[PDB]
Amino acid sequence: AFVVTDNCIKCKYCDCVEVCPVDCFYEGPNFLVIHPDECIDCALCEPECPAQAIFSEDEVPEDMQEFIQLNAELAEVWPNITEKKDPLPDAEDWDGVKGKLQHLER
Numbered sequence: 143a144f145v146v147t148d149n150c151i152k153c154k155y156c157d158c159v160e161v162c163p164v165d166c167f168y169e170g171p172n173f174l175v176i177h178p179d180e181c182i183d184c185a186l187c188e189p190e191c192p193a194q195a196i197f198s199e200d201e202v203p204e205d206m207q208e209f210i211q212l213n214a215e216l217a218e219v220w221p222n223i224t225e226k227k228d229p230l231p232d233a234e235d236w237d238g239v240k241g242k243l244q245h246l247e248r
């Protein structure tokens with residue numbers, strides 16, 4: 143499974159959803175998650191993310207291990223997003239800011 147991590151929060155560019163062959167992205171107000179069960183590990187999404195927030199499960203940084211389980215949980219409660227939409231307004235101001243998990247909205 144591929145995992146979306148911290149830098150997506152408050153950025154949510156949505157370029158990743160365009161490339162997914164199986165539509166396994168689920169949408170929150172200010173973040174996206176990959177459903178671990180439906181992802182076929184094609185790796186097509188991670189060159190696409192401008193925030194470089196997507197990682198293969200086995201490459202997730204040590205300080206971001208929480209995200210693996212977070213993506214699995216939130217994928218069960220959020221709606222499926224199959225079409226790209228515009229980035230959040232101030233997306234590039236928040237891109238690269240660290241510790242944005244304190245700003246995650248359910």
Ligand code: SF4
Pocket residue numbers: 143144161162163164165166167176180181182183184185186187188
């Ligand atoms: S690795 Fe492939 S199947 Fe998994 S979320 Fe990314 S584009 Fe979709």
Ligand code: F3S
Pocket residue numbers: 146149150151153154155156157158159173174190191192193194195196
């Ligand atoms: S910022 Fe998030 S919405 Fe997709 S394009 Fe990157 S994982």
